[PDB]
Amino acid sequence: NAQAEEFKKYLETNGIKPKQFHKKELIFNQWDPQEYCIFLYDGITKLTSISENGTIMNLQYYKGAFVIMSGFIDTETSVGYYNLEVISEQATAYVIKINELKELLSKNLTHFFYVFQTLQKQVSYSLAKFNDFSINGKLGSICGQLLILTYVYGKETPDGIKITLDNLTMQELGYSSGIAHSSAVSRIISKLKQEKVIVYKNSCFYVQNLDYLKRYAPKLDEWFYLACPATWGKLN
Template identity: 30%
Template sequence: MDSHVLQEYLDKHSFRVVVKKRKNYLTYEGLQDRYAYVLKSGIIKTSVISPDGREFNLRYINNLEIVSLLRDEYSQFIDAPFNIRVESEQAELYQIDRVQFWKDINQSKNLQMYVKDYYRERLMYSMKKMQQMLMNGKFGAVCTQIYELYDTFGITTKEGLLIDFVVTNEEIAHFCGITSASSVNRMMQQLKESGAIKMQDRKILITDLDMLKDHIIL
């Protein structure tokens, strides 16, 4: 997915930039909104609420990307498909009138290709995530989520692969559909005792990536 196409489009327009602080929500699932949003800087998290009121995390986003689905081309207002919450100290997002955005997309082949790739990648991600959650079991799901966090925030250090972002066990539980953070605590302790991970300044340090991957059906 070529983000340069999206950046060029944004650079040609003077879209309003919305600034939100940490833990503030940009949208709520089901709330009507007339805008599409593109992350400019910062880290956000998308999530949905189950019928019984539990939160299920979808993914973290930390790069230039459309963060709200576009849905149909003509409705001025649509229901937000998920919650969007700021996880960094602050985040900046371009706010674009969604009907105008679709008009611009339909007039640009490059933007059309970007949007097609965007939906294709989101679909493949969702399918892979569902497969991993169903096939790996709870312990494998936690390992899968740690690996995904490494893929999003990982940096190489002398000690190992550092997930350079503080993620609580409760948040990991919400990503894996596990109701109790204490269950994740036990699994994290098991990974520490096996030598796969350790904690460094409240951040996860992967010390044996192969051992972690042994528990994942990729």
């Protein structure tokens, strides 16, 4: 990702070193009074929250390279009581105090635009998810999740589009944002497997019916086409 690579170089040019995190660590947390801009360079994370119950809610997934901001750029205060949890075995991120992100974007509108554009992708992502859920329910949500996994990690092979992610992490990601390991979601996913939309073979998973995923997640398909046209184009 070229635009992201230039942002990494811009961060290091201003003396910002990367930090390494491990699965289950929090890059930022809902209790910290200080808010941050995270430039997630490599790895996979989820945004989580907690209800009074202590129930962990998975709200959103992010992969490197991407920007996640836990506070508003102007007030520097929280956008919500969120944690950013690493779910890949390792992740690399640049962790900047929000007051400094401001200074840096102030001096290079190209990198301002890069971060601005990431927020725009998030906004339209959530609206597309809402639309697909409003049309097709949890099946739209799950097909959308699988569809984005296929486009981001899939590689065409004779056996179909192989998901090139370790099986451990992949099965976590098959679950859409919401409650942890919902049985209703597990049944949806295994039903797609039973119908051979995604199939296990020789220790790997292959999407063999991409059209089915596109059918039930049409608005996330359009979102990805509009948001990441080159990646979309590779498998269409």
